[PDB]
Amino acid sequence: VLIFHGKPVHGAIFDMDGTMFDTERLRFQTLQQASQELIGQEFSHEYLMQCLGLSATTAEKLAQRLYKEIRKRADEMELEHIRKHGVPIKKGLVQVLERLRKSGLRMAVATSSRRAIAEEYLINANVYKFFDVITCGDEVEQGKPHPEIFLKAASQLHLDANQCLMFEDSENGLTSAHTSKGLTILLKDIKEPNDEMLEKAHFYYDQMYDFLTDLDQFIPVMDMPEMQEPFPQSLNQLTVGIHGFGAIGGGYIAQILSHWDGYTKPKRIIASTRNSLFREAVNAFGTYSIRYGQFSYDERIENMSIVDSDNEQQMLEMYTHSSLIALCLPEQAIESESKIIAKGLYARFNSQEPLTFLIILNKVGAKYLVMKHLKEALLELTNDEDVTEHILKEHYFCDTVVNRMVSKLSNQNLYRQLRIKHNFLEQHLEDVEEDCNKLTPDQLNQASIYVDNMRRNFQPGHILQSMDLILFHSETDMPIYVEKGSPLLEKLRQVVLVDQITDIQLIKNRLWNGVHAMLAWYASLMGYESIGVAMGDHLVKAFAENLIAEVKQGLAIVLPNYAKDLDRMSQSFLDSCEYAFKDPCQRVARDPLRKLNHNERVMASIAVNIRHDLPYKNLLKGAALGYAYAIQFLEIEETKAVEHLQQQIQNLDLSTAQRRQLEAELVQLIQYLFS
Amino acid sequence: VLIFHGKPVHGAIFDMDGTMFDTERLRFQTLQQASQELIGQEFSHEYLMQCLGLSATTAEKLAQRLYGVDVPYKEIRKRADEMELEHIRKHGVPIKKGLVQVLERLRKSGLRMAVATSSRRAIAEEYLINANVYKFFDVITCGDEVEQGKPHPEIFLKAASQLHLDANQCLMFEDSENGLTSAHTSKGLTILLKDIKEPNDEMLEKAHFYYDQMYDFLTDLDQFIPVMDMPEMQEPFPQSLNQLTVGIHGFGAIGGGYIAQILSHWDGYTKPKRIIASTRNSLFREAVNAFGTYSIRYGQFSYDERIENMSIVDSDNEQQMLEMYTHSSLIALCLPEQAIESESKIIAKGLYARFNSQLETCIEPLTFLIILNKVGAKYLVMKHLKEALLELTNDEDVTEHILKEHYFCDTVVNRMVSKLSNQNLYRQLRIKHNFLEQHLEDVEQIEIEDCNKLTPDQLNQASIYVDNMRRNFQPGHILQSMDLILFHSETDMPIYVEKGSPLLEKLRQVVLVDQITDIQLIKNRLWNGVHAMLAWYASLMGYESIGVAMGDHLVKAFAENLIAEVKQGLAIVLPNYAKDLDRMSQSFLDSCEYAFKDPCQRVARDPLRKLNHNERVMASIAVNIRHDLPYKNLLKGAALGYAYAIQFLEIEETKAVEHLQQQIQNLDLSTAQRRQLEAELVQLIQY
Ligand SMILES: NC(=O)C1=CN([C@@H]2O[C@H](COP(=O)(O)OP(=O)(O)OC[C@H]3O[C@@H](n4cnc5c(N)ncnc54)[C@H](OP(=O)(O)O)[C@@H]3O)[C@@H](O)[C@H]2O)C=CC1
Ligand SMILES: NC(=O)C1=CN([C@@H]2O[C@H](COP(=O)(O)OP(=O)(O)OC[C@H]3O[C@@H](n4cnc5c(N)ncnc54)[C@H](OP(=O)(O)O)[C@@H]3O)[C@@H](O)[C@H]2O)C=CC1
Ligand SMILES: O=C(CO)[C@@H](O)[C@H](O)[C@H](O)COP(=O)(O)O
Ligand SMILES: [Cl-]
Ligand SMILES: [Cl-]
Ligand SMILES: [Cl-]
Ligand SMILES: [Cl-]
Ligand SMILES: [Cl-]
Ligand SMILES: [Cl-]
Ligand SMILES: [Cl-]
Ligand SMILES: [K+]
Ligand SMILES: [Mg+2]
Ligand SMILES: [Mg+2]
C-alpha cells in the first residue's frame, strides 16, 4: 500500500502507445507511408492527431467521415521497424515499474492496440513480467475515450479505479482514465497538453523520468547489501564509467555499480585499461568474476565494456553517456589522465543530467590534486575561464574512503588461467560434434530453423555455466564512504554518506595505509610474499601492533574528537590483514619513496610524535625498512634514497635540532639493517 | 569452529595426489599404455601394485629384475608423464567422489584450509585450477619448498604455521604411508583415506580416523555440520557442483517449475552436475538443449529463476531413459494418474537396467519421489510397477528385490504451476531469435600489445586462445540478460516427503515426516476442500475461472472465512502442525488471487465423492461441531456441492438427499446434531 502525495495507492494501470513506448511517432510515419501505397495520397495530420489513443475499430469510424488494408500494411511496417531497431522504451519505464512492483501494487496495462500487437511489444521490451493482467482493444466493447477499458483493467486486478494510478499520453485516453475516477497521470509525447487535459490530470510530468524522480521520494531506499546477495535482474537505460579497470575499479567499484539502487542496474559499465590481455579476455568471455577467498565465492560481473585508455573516441563515449564515473588511478596517473578527463567533460558540455565523479585515491587532499590538474588541463584546451568554472561547479566531484583491500591478477597467472580453460573449450567443441506439438507445419518448420542456428551459436558457450574468468582477489568489506552533495549517491545501496571525510582520510592514511606499508616492508625483507602468511609470524604481528599504538597516541592529540573510535579502526585493520593470503606484499610495498614523503603515511606520524614527546621507535624502524626495501628489492640506488631522506626531513615542520637528530637516528638504522 | 569427534577443528590440510584426485590410478594406466607402445607388453598390475610407496630408483631396479636390465623404464616413465598431462589438460583432473561436498562443508564451517603436496608449485597449482578447487585453499605448501620432505613433518608443520594454527587444531588428509607419518608426527588429527592399495596395520594404528573412500568421510562429517534452513524466494543455488546426477521423470508444470528448484538448491553446500528430464514435447526438448538452460517466472515478484545443468531427453528413447535410472541418485516421478499405467513399463526397464548395471552409481540405492495429488499415490505406482517388472523379468525374487532395494517416498506439494503453451513458446523463440540476429550484426563490426611480463611465444599463444574463445563465446553473450521462460509458478517452497532415505536427510527445501498421513489430511481438508468449495461457488455465480471469481468481493470473502473455519479445527486435531497450517492458509489465498489458467470444472469434478463423511468437506464440519466452532461457511460449501451436482452434472435431487443422509449418519455426532445439520443443508440447496 504505497502513499503517493497523501493518497493510498493499491494498483497502477499503464497505457502502452506513447506512455510506456514511443511507438505513437512510428504509427504516424507508417500510416502515412502505407496510405501512399494503397490510396495514392497520405492521410491528414489532424486525422492522425485525433487518432491518438484510439482502437483500429474506433479510428476506422473517423476515416469513413473524411482503412483495414492500410492499417494492416502500416502494422506490418511498424513490426519490421521493431524487429530491426527494437521497441523504443521511454527512459525511466523499467525503473518506475520495478519500484511499483516491489511496493506490492497490483499492476496492469490498458492499451488501444489489439492483443497480438500489444503482447509482441511488451515481450520485446521485456516488461510483460511486471503486469498481472492486460486489457486490449479486442477485449473492450466500447473503446476510448469511454472508461470501460480502464474499469475492466481495475476489475481484473480485484481493485477499485480510485485505488489505482493511471498513466496516459493522449487526450482521449486521459478522459477514459479520468471518467473511470482514478488517480490520472499525464505524460507529454506528441501533443502539447490542453486546458481540458491539464484540468483532468491529478499530476503532470514532461517525461517519464520526471515522474520517477517525484515517485522516488515515497519509495524506500534499500539497506547495505550482504556479501552473496544477488544484483538486480532488470536493466535501466543509464550508463556508468570506471576510469581505471584495475584492483579497486574492477574488484570493488564494479560491485557497487552492479548493486546500484537495488531496483534497476546500469545497462552498460564502461571500464578503461591499457592492459590488452585483461581487455581482450573480458570482452571475449563477456563477463569477469571477483574472487572472495574468505568464503570461496566467485561474484560474476556482467554488462562490462572494456575499452582502451589511449582510444580517444571510446573515452569521450564514457564521459558523454555515463551518469556516474569512478576515477580509480594512483597519484602518478592523475597528471597524464587529467587531459583525457578534461576532453571528456568538454565533450559532455558540447552535447545536450549532472555527472557524479567519484575520486578513489589513497592521499590526504585527493580532490585538490585531481581538481587542480583538471582545471589546468581544461583551461589549456578550452582557452576560456567562463566554460571551465561552469564545468567544475556543474558536476559533483566527490572525495571517498575505501577500506576494502583488493588484489589484481598477474598477466602470467591470467595466461595460465586462459591456457587451462582453452583446453576445456577445445574438448567441449569435439563433444558437440520437431515432431507435432499443436502447431502448423509452417510454424514447426520455422521453429526448427530458429532452434538450429540458436543451438549453433549458443552451444559452444554452454561451458560458461561453470567456467568463470577470475581477475580479482578481494576481501568482503562492502560499504564505501563518500561526501554529501550528489542526490544520486543518496539512493545507491553500497554508498554511505559522511560529512568530515578529510578527518577519516587522515586516520585512513596513517593508521591503515601507513601500518600496512611498514609491516609489508618488514615482511618482504624477511622473505614473505603474502600479507596473510606474514601476519602468522609473531614478530610481524607484534611490529604492526606496536606501530598501531605509536600512531594512535599521536592521532589522539591531533584529533581528540576521533580518539574514541581509533581502537575499533586499528582492530578492523588487523582483522583485514590477518587472513589476506591472496594479497601480495609487493602491491602493498609499491612506491616506497612516495609513501616516505614528509606529508605521507610514514614521516607525518613520526613528526607528530616528536613534537608531542611521544615514542616513535617502531615508526622510525618502519621508515628505515622503507628505504631498505627501495634499495634492495626495487634497486633505486642508495644516493637517491639519501637525497630523498634528507629533502623530506628538511620539509618536516620540526626544529633544526630535531631535523638533524631524526636524519642521524634514521641513516644509522638503515646502515644497521644492511650491515 | 567445527567440532569433529569432541575435538575443536580450526583448519584442514589436504594431500593432493591419491587423497583429493584419483591421479595414482591414472599414473597406473599411463604406465601400462606407455609400456605397450615401447617394449611391446604392459607392466603387470601386480608389479605396479608392488611399486606403490617405493621410490623411482627401487621401481626401476624391480622392473629390471622382472623385464630385463635393458628395459627402458626412464623412457616409459617420461612417456607415461606426457600421457597424464595430455589427459588431465583436455579431459580434466580426476576428482575423488565427494571431495567438493567435503571442501564446501569445511569452508562454510569457517576452517582455514591448505594443500600439503610433494608435487612442485608449478604443476600443483595447474591441477588445483584444472579441478576448480584452488578457490577453497588459503595457502599451498609444496615439496620443492621444504628442506626435508615426507615422511618428515616439516611440510604439514609449515602448512599449519602459514594458516596461523598449531598442527593439533588441523584435520590432515593423506593416502600414502610416508604422508600419514608426516601428518601424524606434526601432531594433527590424521584422516587416512584408502586409494588403491589396502593400508598396512601400522598405518591403521597411527591414523586417528580411517575411511575406505572420501564419501565415507563425507557421511561422517555430515553428523557434525548442520542441515541448512528452508530456502527463501530469490535465494541463489550453490556455486559448487557435486558428481551426482538426478532425474525428473515427466518434465511438466510441477517437474520443471518446482522439483527442478528443490534439486537445484539440494543441500546448500553443492548441487547435482546434471538434471535429466523426460518429455515427448520435441519443441521443449530442443529449445532447452539449444539454450542449455531455462527459467521459472514468479509473477508476484516478477523474478526469473534460471535452472542450470539441465539435459532434456525423449520419453520414448530407451537408451536415454535407461541412462536416467542407471546414473541418477534421486528421481522424481511428476506424471498424472492416467500416465502411471503406461509409464510403469519404462520405470520397470529402468530399475531392471540399474540392477544389471556394473557401474558404481547403480550399487547405491535410488530415492524415488512420487509427485501426485491423490491419496495412496505411491501404492498405485508400486502396484503397476510390480505388474510391469513381472511382465518384463518373469522372476518373482528379482521383482521383489528391486521393490525393497530402493526408497519409494510419498510426497505433498502445495505450489500451483502452469506450463507454457507451444503457441506462446514459438512466439518467444521467434522474438529471442530476432535479438540473436541483431546481436550477430555487432560482433562482426584480436590485439595483444607489448610484452606485459610475457615471452613472445606465450604472447602469440595467448592471442590464439582469446580469439578462439571470442569466436565461440561472443554469440552467447546475449544469454547474460536473456531467459527461456517455460513455467509460471507460485512462491510455495516446502515439499513434504516420507522420512527413510539417507539422501533426503540434508536436502534443505525438503520437510521430512515419519508419516505423510497428517500433512496429506491437511492438504485434503485445508487446500483441496476449500479449492473445491470455492470452485462450486464460482461456477454457480457464472465465473469460468477462480482468478476472475476473486474479483467478486463475496467470493474472496467466502474463501478467507472458509480457510479460517477449517484452520481452527485442524489446529485442535493437529496442534503440532500449527505453523504449517498458518503458512499453507496464506499460500492458498495468494494462489487463488490470479488463478486464470486452471478452470473451475477440473477442481469441481466428482462433488458427491468429495462430500463423503470422511472427506475434505463433511469431515471438517463434524470436527468443528464436536469442538463447538463456527461451521456456517463449511455448511454453505456443502450445500454448493450438492447444488453444483444437480445444476451442472444434472444429478437428481432424490440422489443428493439420499447421499448426505447416509454421510451425516456416519459422522461421529450427537443424535440431535445429525438432524440439525440435515435440516439446514437441504434449505440452502433449494435456494
Ligand atoms: N586496491 C586497494 O587495495 C585499494 C586501492 N586504493 C587506491 O585506489 C587507487 C587504485 O589503485 P589500484 O587499482 O589499487 O592499483 P592499480 O595499479 O590496479 O590502478 C589501476 C588503474 O590505474 C592505471 N594506472 C596505473 N599506473 C598508471 C600510470 N602510470 N598512468 C596511467 N594509468 C595508470 C591502470 O592502468 P593498466 O590497467 O593499464 O595497468 C589501471 O587502470 C590507488 O590510488 C589506491 O591507492 C584505496 C584503497 C584500497
Ligand atoms: N501443478 C500443480 O498444480 C500441482 C501438480 N501436482 C501433481 O503433479 C502431477 C503432474 O502435474 P503436471 O506436471 O501439471 O501435469 P502435466 O500434464 O503438466 O505434465 C505431466 C507430465 O506427464 C507426462 N504425461 C501426461 N499425460 C501422459 C500420458 N497420458 N502418457 C504419458 N506421459 C504423460 C507429460 O509428458 P509431456 O511433457 O510430453 O506432455 C509431462 O511430462 C499431477 O498428478 C498433479 O496433480 C501436485 C500438486 C500441484
Ligand atoms: O588502502 C588499502 C586498504 O586498506 C590498501 O590495500 C592499500 O591499497 C595498500 O596499503 C597500498 O597502498 P597504495 O600503494 O595503493 O597507496
Ligand atoms: Cl531507464
Ligand atoms: Cl609467504
Ligand atoms: Cl620508489
Ligand atoms: Cl561428489
Ligand atoms: Cl614432500
Ligand atoms: Cl500433492
Ligand atoms: Cl496428496
Ligand atoms: K551425503
Ligand atoms: Mg496512447
Ligand atoms: Mg599422496
UniProtKB/TrEMBL annotation, chain A:
Keyword NADP: no
Residues bound to NADPH 1: A247, I248, T273, R274, N275, L329, E337, N362, V406, K408, R587, R590
Molecular-function GO terms, alphabetical: hydrolase activity; metal ion binding; nucleotide binding; oxidoreductase activity
Binding site for Mg(2+) 2: D399, T400
Keyword Nucleotide-binding among record annotations: yes
Swiss-Prot/TrEMBL keywords: Hydrolase, Metal-binding, Nucleotide-binding, Oxidoreductase
Residues reported in the UniProt entry to bind Mg(2+) 1: D15, D17, E24, E168, D169
UniProt-listed SUPFAM superfamilies: 6-phosphogluconate dehydrogenase C-terminal domain-like, HAD-like
Binding-site list for NADPH 2: A247, I248, T273, R274, N275, E337, N362, V406, K408, R587, R590
Highest taxon of source: Bacteria
Mannitol dehydrogenase C-terminal domain ranges (all copies): 508-651
NCBIfam families membership: bifunc_MtlD, HAD-SF-IA-v3
Name by which UniProt lists this protein: HAD hydrolase, family IA, variant 3
Taxonomic lineage of the native organism: Bacteria, Pseudomonadati, Pseudomonadota, Gammaproteobacteria, Moraxellales
